[PDB]
Amino acid sequence: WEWNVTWNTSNPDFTKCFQNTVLVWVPCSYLWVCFPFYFLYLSHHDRGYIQMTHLNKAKTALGFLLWIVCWADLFYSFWAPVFLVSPTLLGITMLLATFLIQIERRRGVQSSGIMLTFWLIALLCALAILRSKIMTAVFRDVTFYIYFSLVLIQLVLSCFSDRSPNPCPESSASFLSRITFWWITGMMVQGYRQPLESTDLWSLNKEDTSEQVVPVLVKNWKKECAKSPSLFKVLYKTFGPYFLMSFLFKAVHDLMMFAGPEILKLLINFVNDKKAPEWQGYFYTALLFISACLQTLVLHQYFHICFVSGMRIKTAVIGAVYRKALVITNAARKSSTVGEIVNLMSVDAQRFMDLATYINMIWSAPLQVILALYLLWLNLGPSVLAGVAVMVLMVPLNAVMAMKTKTYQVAHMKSKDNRIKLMNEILNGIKVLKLYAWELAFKDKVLAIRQEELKVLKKSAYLAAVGTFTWVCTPFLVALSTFAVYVTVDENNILDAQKAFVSLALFNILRFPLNILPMVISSIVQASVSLKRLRVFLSHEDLDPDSIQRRPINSITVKNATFTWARNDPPTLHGITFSVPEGSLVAVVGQVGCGKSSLLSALLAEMDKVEGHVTVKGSVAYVPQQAWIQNISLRENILFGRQLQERYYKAVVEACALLPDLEILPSGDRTEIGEKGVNLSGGQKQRVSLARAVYCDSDVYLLDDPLSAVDAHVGKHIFENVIGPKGLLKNKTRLLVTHAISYLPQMDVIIVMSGGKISEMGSYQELLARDGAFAEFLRTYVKLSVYWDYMKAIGLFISFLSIFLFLCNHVASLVSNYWLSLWTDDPIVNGTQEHTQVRLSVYGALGISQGITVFGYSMAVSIGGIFASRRLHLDLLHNVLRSPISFFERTPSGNLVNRFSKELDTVDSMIPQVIKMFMGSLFNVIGACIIILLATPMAAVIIPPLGLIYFFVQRFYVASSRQLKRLESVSRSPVYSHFNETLLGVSVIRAFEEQERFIRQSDLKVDENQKAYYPSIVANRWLAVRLECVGNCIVLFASLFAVISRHSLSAGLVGLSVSYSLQVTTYLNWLVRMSSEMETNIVAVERLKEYSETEKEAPWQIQDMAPPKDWPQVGRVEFRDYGLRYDLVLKHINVTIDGGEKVGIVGRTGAGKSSLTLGLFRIKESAEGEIIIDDINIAKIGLHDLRFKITIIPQDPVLFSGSLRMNLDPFSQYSDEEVWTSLELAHLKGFVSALPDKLNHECAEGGENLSVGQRQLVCLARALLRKTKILVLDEAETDDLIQSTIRTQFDDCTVLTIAHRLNTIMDYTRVIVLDKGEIQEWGSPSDLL
């Protein structure tokens, strides 16, 4: 080895000894170090054995022949020391190669990465020797030609995939296809033609499905708890081994990327040095291209590994949380807010998956800094210390800022949750709000919290501006400090391109690890507390099934059993004993808080058994007090997974008297009942629950007050056909918690208790004869138009200022780098450069302008986003409130809420950041291309083909990824939606013993989410590789055209072009990523303005024909030929209600009774009618005016969240004395004075704390405080009170009354009867009879 032939001569030939030693030791050596390690994978991972195919044999036979040929050399040598050891070593490694394909066949691997890279390395080594041997010119040469031809054919064979031993093609994908991710390209094509749906999505890998990952974590956590508990131990014990490879991949990727600046150094030396061989530059550019491609492949395999591991972590955590929820104790379940348990899978699971892809940064960010610093130390020297100072002045600050960001993020979710719930209260109750005309206040109420939001979003915007400044300017800031110090401390400190641009490249390579390090640390610390929460959920006590002896088929046996609701709380059921025989009806009897429901909970192993013995025999069907309804159809609610039996189902439905409920419901039993679908009354929910229990056909039934909400006739019918001895459950052991005596004599056994203690149980007649506790009990009683629209929403001046500042930034950066190229071209004079202070001053001024302009650019667009979010929320609120209630009933509340939630969040927190990042990446790519073109114009021919290659990759990915990012977001909500359902009905899940079914359903939901998430991450890793190679071949091309024209280009220009080509690599990938994110997030801005053009209500205030202050002078109502639609519900209505005359409206279901009120409040428009109050037409008056001058007490009053005073008057227009007087007149003074908060009592959503009677009296208080002459009543215990109050002082005012009860309407004169919209009778009740 001497530079005489390997470097100096224009023919770069390797020496003969080098050829025969190192070029042969490289490949043989590769297989020797990998062979042992490869058994680990081959053994731990198995897939069967591949059959005997021609390909496998062809490879094995060539491996035998290759070994022979290599040993044939040893034979001829036997017939120089290197002529013995080298052929034998090659033969032995060849014998290891053929044995390896053999064992790979045995272990079922179709595509072999080792048997592809090994042949590639051998081929390259053979190629080098081949060229040398063909340039030298029989004896030993022909053996090498045979070896090379066989190696080439072996390499070609190794590319094809062997036979296998809508599934994901990844399993059958070749290594060439598993490194380029070519197997997803089909979806990239398919997503371009046919929009994707869930069926097209590939099935999850068997090692990736929840059915496999979750039991691993469950088993490992069980082992860890049995050992002692730390969730981190299990987390890095189960997912650690697969996550290990990401480390090797990240280390190799770091080394490969650092190799780039070294090759740039060598290329700058070559260009700067004439009289050098021309092949040296070509070798350097080929090496740079190879290094860039290898770095791309290794890096993207690393992320694939990280992203798969994070997804597995999320799946396992979600499954473990779901399975632990069904075993958790009541005490513990209540300790953690239900919403908190949903958050465990909503955020904690997500945060883990998001963080996993970057855990390796904690070890590689410092490495990419330390190695870069060493590299910088090789170029500049001690001056690099100044650069370190900049890091000490940057990385900490960002970290602090990063933490603050998270804080503000939390505060954001403080206000977001503060509004969405309020928005729900607005969305559930639009009828009452429109009638009470508080639309404008709530608008401001809602608007107030948005302003509070922006108070927090603007703080986050200041932080985000600091973050983009500290990210994009980080490479320059370090470069400026280090260059200034380097050129100032020493006068002989020459600055050549080699010692500047290479360093500059390093600064681009220290941009990423430097600023992601803080973020990641932040994402670690936050994840840390999330982890603790998970541990808190996974260390909670379990409910031992042995507590209740569940013997398969004296039916229920309890002796000396005391139960608790908690370990430390006192017993709720003290010393209970009773024996319920098979097929007997037992009624639990007691007062409120006695312990009746606790008995049924104890029989289900829900109570904590401190002592005793319970021996419930056979399956148990639980009808809980609080009915649990699944969001599935009513048929599947009753079925509860069990097979459908038409005769049994049709015997169960009417026996529960569910036939009228089926009739009223739109789709019958196929209607979507539950919270999300159609809402059901409490009695209907109890029926469904009872019907589900009856269909389940258990032997033991625990009916915790099934007849609480059903009416007396319906309850008696139900007991007759279901629970009674002559019903459906005649032979079933039925336990019924009741407080109604009507069915007590039919009960076989009455268990009457007091204070959680058995108190003289027995049969009804015997208990009555005994005259004890039971007697006492009885005696008790996308086009661009949307981008233009968002640009308008931001503000045209702000947007154009942001564009101007961005252009200034990129021009400044490009000009500063060109200035550096000129500065490095200053000829050394006597060991210095004449222009050092001037050049450095220009560089510093340009960069200071660049930094301040970056700060301005980020801040400007951030403020524009704030403004756009403000205006968009104002527009959405105004349009929603202006829309009539027909729109409100038509559109599901889900999409109306989605307009305000999870979509405003994208507009206000994602779109500004994503647009900043997109614009930055796009103009960085444009600037790099411009610099390369300026340096080497001949590279222009490169632009079309690669551009074409870009275009398709730009066209295919963005079309497909969007769908993948929608479908995923489609399946994420049900996973939590199921879990919530599971959490609400845990007792019902355990009582029916259907834990496995719900566990499998949750696993299916999670797999549905992952079947869209996995294609998304693989799409990212496919797009990444595609764009990288394009940015990689331009690095090779820029370098190649620099080498071609080295006689005219200075070293500085070459280094500048190569460095910009190095960074355009990551810039192109980030460009398209953010381009797809633009469409996905700008669809939200499009959907925000989905109601701006819909039909709105009549103007609230006309102000041209406004009525006088006392508009209802007497309250003379006149329906003059009224006709209301939504063919005509109201028709031919010509009636006159005199001022201060009580009038009621009677009619059956389907008449226009209620629709008549809708006529008074102009909620809908008159198809044909001229309703006039006094001497003024209603249709001419603005809505608010009439809605303010007329009052309505609806069917169900809505108590909005807030204080009682804001309920009675949000406009706070009426004085406190008026509020007090109205509340006293509403029979509410005693109660309203009782709250500690006086008038400021904080009532929850819908007034859950208040009783129904109270809420009704609060609505009456609202109507009374209004003090209007026209009042409407909608009638459905407190009826006596509300009727008396409406008859007390409102006699002066004209009252219309729509009551489903004739008793109250009889009191009111002038009754109007509506048969089918027509006026059937118009006169006083005296004339009625």
Ligand SMILES: C[C@]12CC[C@H]3c4ccc(OS(=O)(=O)O)cc4CC[C@@H]3[C@@H]1CCC2=O
């Ligand atoms: C670190 C990051 C990768 C890319 C980053 C980036 C890239 C270019 C950029 O501006 S650019 O002008 O250089 O295009 C800004 C940023 C800001 C932060 C942004 C991400 C936050 C989380 C993440 O994975």
Ligand SMILES: N[C@@H](CCC(=O)N[C@@H](CS)C(=O)NCC(=O)O)C(=O)O
């Ligand atoms: N220089 C980076 C290149 C990798 C990269 O893609 N960086 C960012 C984006 S600029 C990232 O992690 N993206 C992951 C993704 O594509 O989701 C490194 O060393 O990791």
